[PDB]
């Protein structure tokens, strides 16, 4: 039984411009087993309309997923991705840094 911690990336589909439609992406990869819980957060709450890709894995048998939602980036708005997994003592939050 091999358990691998997730790797979390929070990024936008396009470079962010305040006031134009975009997509907020949370890329969770390199984790085993498959059972994972991923949430997209806006100003402390949980975004209800979030879609995710179909489960797949890399050459090293590690799964990856893409959780995404449609959003209009604005200043004063804070976005983050929360990922819970069997290998984490507590859920991990990665915030949306613009130039990241």
């Amino acid at each position: 039984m091999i358990q691998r911690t997730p790797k979390i990336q929070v990024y936008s589909r396009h470079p962010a411009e305040n006031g134009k439609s975009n997509f907020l992406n949370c890329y969770v990869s390199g984790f085993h087993p498959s059972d994972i819980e991923v949430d997209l957060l806006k100003n402390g709450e949980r975004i209800e309309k979030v879609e995710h890709s179909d489960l797949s894995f890399s050459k090293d048998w590690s799964f990856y997923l893409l959780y995404y939602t449609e959003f209009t980036p604005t200043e004063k708005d804070e976005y983050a991705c929360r990922v819970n997994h069997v290998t984490l003592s507590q859920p991990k939050i990665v915030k949306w840094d613009r130039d990241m």
Epitope: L41, N43, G44, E45, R46, E48, E78, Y79, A80, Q90, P91, I93, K95
Partner: nanobody, 115 residues
């Protein structure tokens, strides 16, 4: 900065009821979502019930229907009503809160033992 205070744990027979309460310090506009995570033996805490400032609630798959979470919006205190308790509910329940900047704050945790 923000400290979470938990109360209401203890021992209870199956089929009983317990009410947990978690209160947050600071101003009212400091915490958005408050909820509870409970320990699983495999170094992981799973969701029990969380509520946002506007009342958007979510429950775990194992506590649907049985647990109810309510928020006293005048302050930053939330309550969890647990009904139809089972032996499988015996775990340490952690309160948590998310700030409007997505900073998670956790409490020490209270033991709920179901015999």
């Amino acid at each position: 900065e923000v400290k979470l205070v938990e109360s209401g744990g203890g021992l209870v027979q199956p089929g009983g009821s317990l009410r947990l309460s978690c209160a947050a310090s600071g101003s009212i506009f400091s915490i958005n979502t408050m909820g509870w995570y409970r320990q699983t033996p495999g170094k992981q805490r799973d969701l029990v019930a969380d509520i946002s400032s506007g009342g958007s609630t979510k429950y775990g798959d194992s506590v649907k229907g049985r647990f109810t979470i309510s928020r006293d919006n005048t302050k930053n205190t939330v309550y969890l009503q647990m009904n139809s308790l089972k032996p499988e509910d015996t775990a340490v329940y952690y309160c948590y809160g998310l700030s409007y900047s997505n900073d998670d704050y956790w409490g020490q945790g209270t033991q709920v033992t179901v015999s």
